[PDB]
Design an enzyme around this catalytic site. Structure first.
Site: not given
Ligand SMILES: [Cu+2]
Ligand SMILES: [Cu+2]
Ligand SMILES: [Cu+2]
Ligand SMILES: [Cu+2]
Lengths: 661, 310, 316
Positions: B7, B22, B26
């Site tokens: 993340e 991550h 996005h």
């Molecule tokens: Cu996500």
């Protein structure tokens, strides 16, 4: 309910069987609750002691977990929380008492166990359970002096108390004087510090501090208290500051640390205590005893001196490196905020240590090594000396040497922290223009001390002694009441909140010179810390000695932070007959920065406040003086900011015995 | 560790090396339409956590990320027969019952609810402004679990309830390797079992995966009405699975409820029965099972109607 | 790893850092009498592997080294009830029998043997030169182990036999923490168990820890030293046996097994997946306190008595 009051009866006469009846009550114990020794003639006994008993407490027969582990420790053996094995036994018993859902089952479990396990152990295990259960809160636990006087009193008195109680009728009984300055003669210069080392008060404070902040059990069972690591550092650090003060008042130098463990220990100490539970006496330590590798198979101690040395070498490395390593291999940084707290848990070895296995159990293991010099492999079937029990550890002079060393290690971290900037300890607008002290019938800026006898009922603790009262007369240091008077100017236009922080140190050194900051900062003893509201313009603040937040009342002891509380009569150093010069220091810090937003009604040793989640001051403990001086600063009188003030005080002792009135 | 790395949380042991994988994904996906800002346009829906789940690509990107985690989980050693057996405890059956519906049958449908959006409508004449949401809902139900103690002492246990599809897309009884990744957690709660046998019941609305209606409309809470998959009108076959683990091992000594502050209340890995590969010999759910587990065929029926809340 | 680090074998992952600890110790101890060579003297007995065991200090130095290994072993997780249970198998008893001696009783004594040192005697008139050695010896014995299958299929198992003292030096029944480190391996062999009941018998001379007389005189542990001496009044000892699941312990391998001084194990791999000293190498699981509650069904304990007799038997 009654149940709360009925548990307190367990503390009564610890070695008298529970069926013998305590106070105006007696327990109606099942026969499967009777001990194997007494069960085969239980009927004859229950009958024999049934007489003269007012009330009778019933006890329901319950399941009772296996009590093998609790019973592993002998009944006539000593109990110390420093010894690895005892820790596992106590923590297991604590777990049983803690694990009884109802206050009725706790009473039943207790009544059964009491006469099967070691009294000293029982007392501890119960004390811990009661203090940290929710149903048994605000419960006033009897002073451990009253239940175990053998840890607090010359053994000589016991045969006098037995004589007096048997020969003389109640009401006509003379109070038993407790000998003072009895462990050594004047050939040993250390004997002068009896009034501190051997004082009932300070020994109780130490024992109790370790009750409320244990280092092993369960985080919900009281181990993970806010900043307990820093607490451990600071409290013990203040013990030595106060000790070093008292040393200067007896024409001695500052306590020398335990440089290295291979060199002999010059100062021996025979404590003169006789354990009535072990039925033996505590061993003494001779002059020039040397630490030896321990192999106490029974106690589960297999530790070499080199192990200790290895732990120290590693801890020093971490402190200099500036970070530690957890079990996982990750690095945690000894920063300005949490550094000291971490280090504390590492050094004492609390389960909160980020890597016990690497950095060891340095403080605790030291206590054991020092207590077993006389019998390290158990070949002589002797128990540990006084340094092996928290209850008695402070009596020995070596305590201060070992604790002095430990402090130097903490210091090694503190001197790495960045100096407090002029900015950081200035309070914009506030200016303290003077502080003074006044005692009734004494010049300004003058404190007085003396001796004072007090009385304590040791009746509950005297097993198999004719019932009645047994008053003992303690002689202890005392100070005349006084009050501070502080002149503070606001010059802001708004009500300013502030923390008043009051410390006291020696004025000069032993060589006669006005002390430098580098030296003096470490000799400052905290005297008070309280919140004050200042009106615009001028403010005259007054504070009594007995309002001190470092201290707890007389009543609590007989009946230096964030534990049980420091004894009130020990608040002021002794000083000299000719007068001892001292610098009184006050600082007003900006409470808005120092504030700790929190809800509390405040709580006692059982001063109040520290049992709630958080510790009520964001600043480091010993805050003005914990760190090194900023550039240019050299002595106290140029360290000062406007919002601080210094005052020359003179401490006069008078060798006389005043009454309590 | 891997989670913080992937993340990119400041807890990552080396952000600079392993990146912000991550999150940056996005942004890339949300800016395909204007990546150099020449069109002075803002990011699409995948660029905001509030809206990211609306886009189908979310599940593709998050699917990929999951495969990376899996790559670690398949390296871990299989749970041994020993490790997931509870000596003494045996689960002999689990069923579900809804009012006015056969046993082992779940129902779903549509349901309108109302929400006051008044506080959010800026520069609109004051008053009430109710909006009618249509959303999936399931008929209330309850699990009924038959557990035998055969020990002589009160046994503590964690009830762990998951649900997966029964077969695959081709219509065959699913293999474990496949099915383990399709198990959705339905409940996890502590239970005290008295010696001999006890019949345990748990309502759908007591689920520890879910939070009440009231919280949404009026970890940190899956909507209650979304607890049960939709299923089909013709009925969708599903395996209901329950496990009773030894709470003494799983316990986390400490003082949907409230997982913020201190510790997470389960020592076992998250998705514990099925996070790791099968031990040797195991091939499908029905031979993965230990005594302290149970399987049950459930049928999930949807009905295309809009019901009320009475 | 630790072994290669401590002895210092070129297999050490960092010789330069962790040193040549064991070996250098042997040299230090052997040169106390002349460490700077000023006296032009050679090393004492601890400086040669051939003679090192003669000196008592050997056992002190090797005792220390062992404590270091132990420090690692106590970090390993305890063997779980599961891990050392064999589902179905139950050992219900083990005994030992010597010819002309009560059950569960081992005997020891002295025994002279002869060795031709002729090839070694340089510049000595040729011929035979027989030397008479006196050495500890034990009467031959055999174990008898009662194992129940209760499975319905042939079960393979490893028989693991250790022996320790029963009590301590003070005369109390030993705790596990202590006793686990005093267990000496006595045998380890593969056995096929039929459904129902099995009576396993194993001779002392079949031991996989030992090598025959003939091999040593005319690489493995000497056979005559298999049994501790014991006392004239008898020395109490706990005999322990465990049957582990050979399927888990198995090492798939092709093996020659013919006196490559003990079968041999000169083939690539060592024939047991379990750790060496496997039942007792690690600490006890929670609740366990002494051997008699460490035991699982597939284990058995037996009180043995070791009697010495100060007499010299011939070699036969
Ligand atoms: Cu996500
Ligand atoms: Cu202390
Ligand atoms: Cu201490
Ligand atoms: Cu060697």
């Amino acid at each position: 309910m009654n149940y709360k009051k009925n548990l307190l009866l367990l503390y009564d006469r610890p070695r008298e069987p529970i069926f013998m009846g305590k106070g105006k009550s007696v327990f109606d114990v099942p026969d499967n609750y009777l001990t194997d020794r007494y069960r085969p003639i239980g009927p004859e006994i229950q009958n024999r002691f049934g007489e003269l008993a007012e009330e009778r407490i019933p006890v329901r027969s319950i399941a009772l977990p296996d009590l093998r582990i609790p019973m592993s420790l002998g009944r006539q053996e000593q109990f110390s929380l420093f010894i690895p094995r005892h820790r596992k036994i106590a923590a297991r018993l604590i777990d049983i008492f803690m694990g009884m859902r109802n206050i009725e089952e706790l009473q039943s479990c207790a009544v059964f166990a009491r006469d099967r396990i070691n009294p000293y152990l029982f007392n501890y295990a119960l004390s811990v359970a009661l203090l940290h259960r929710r149903d048994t809160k605000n419960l006033d636990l009897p002073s451990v002096v009253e239940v175990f006087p053998d840890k607090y009193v010359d053994s000589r008195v016991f045969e006098q108390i037995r004589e007096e109680a048997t020969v003389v009728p109640e009401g006509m009984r003379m109070p038993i004087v407790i000998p003072k300055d009895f462990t050594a003669s004047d050939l040993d210069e250390e004997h002068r510090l009896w009034y501190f080392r051997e004082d009932i008060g300070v020994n109780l404070h130490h024992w109790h501090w370790h009750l409320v902040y244990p280092f092993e059990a369960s985080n919900r069972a009281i181990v993970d208290k806010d900043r307990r690591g820093e607490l451990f550092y600071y409290m013990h650090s203040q013990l030595i500051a106060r000790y070093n003060f008292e040393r200067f008042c007896n024409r001695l130098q500052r306590v020398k640390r335990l440089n290295n463990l291979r060199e002999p220990i010059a100062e021996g100490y025979f404590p003169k205590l006789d354990s009535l539970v072990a039925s033996r006496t505590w061993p003494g330590r001779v002059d020039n005893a040397v630490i030896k590798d321990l192999n106490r198979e029974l106690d589960q101690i297999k530790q070499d001196v080199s192990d200790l040395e290895r732990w120290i070498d590693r801890i020093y490395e971490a402190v200099h490196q500036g970070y530690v390593v957890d079990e996982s291999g990750n690095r945690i940084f000894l920063d300005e905020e949490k550094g000291i707290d971490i280090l504390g848990n590492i050094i004492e070895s609390s389960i909160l240590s980020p890597n016990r296995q690497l950095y060891g159990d340095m403080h605790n293991v030291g206590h054991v090594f020092l207590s077993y010099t006389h019998d390290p492999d158990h070949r002589h079937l002797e128990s540990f000396g006084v340094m092996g029990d928290v209850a008695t550890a402070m009596r020995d002079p070596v305590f201060y040497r070992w604790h002095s060393f430990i402090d130097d290690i903490f210091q090694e971290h503190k001197i790495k922290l960045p100096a407090y900037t002029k900015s950081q300890l200035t309070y914009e607008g506030i200016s303290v223009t003077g502080i003074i002290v006044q005692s009734e019938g004494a010049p300004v800026n003058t404190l007085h001390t003396y001796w004072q006898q007090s009385d304590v009922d040791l009746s509950r603790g005297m097993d198999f002694v004719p019932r009645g009262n047994v008053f003992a007369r303690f002689t202890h240091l005392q100070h005349a009441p006084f009050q501070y008077v502080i002149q503070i100017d606001n010059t802001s236009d708004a009500q300013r909140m502030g923390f008043v922080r009051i410390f006291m140190a020696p004025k000069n050194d032993e060589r006669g010179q006005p002390m430098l900051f580098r030296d003096q900062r470490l000799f400052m003893v905290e005297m008070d810390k309280f919140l004050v509201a200042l009106r615009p313009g001028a403010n005259r603040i007054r504070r009594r000695s007995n309002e001190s937040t470092v201290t707890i009342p007389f009543e609590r002891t007989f009946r230096n932070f964030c534990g049980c509380g420091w004894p009130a009569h020990m608040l002021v150093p002794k000083g000299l007959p000719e007068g001892f010069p001292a610098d009184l220091f006050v600082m007003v810090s900006n409470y808005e920065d120092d504030r700790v937003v929190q809800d509390l009604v405040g709580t006692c040793n059982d001063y109040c406040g520290v049992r709630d989640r958080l510790y009520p001051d964001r600043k480091a403990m010993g805050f003005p003086f914990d760190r090194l001086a900023r550039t240019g600063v050299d002595r106290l009188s140029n360290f000062v900011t406007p919002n601080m003030a210094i005052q020359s005080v003179n401490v006069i002792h008078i060798d006389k015995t005043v009454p309590r009135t």
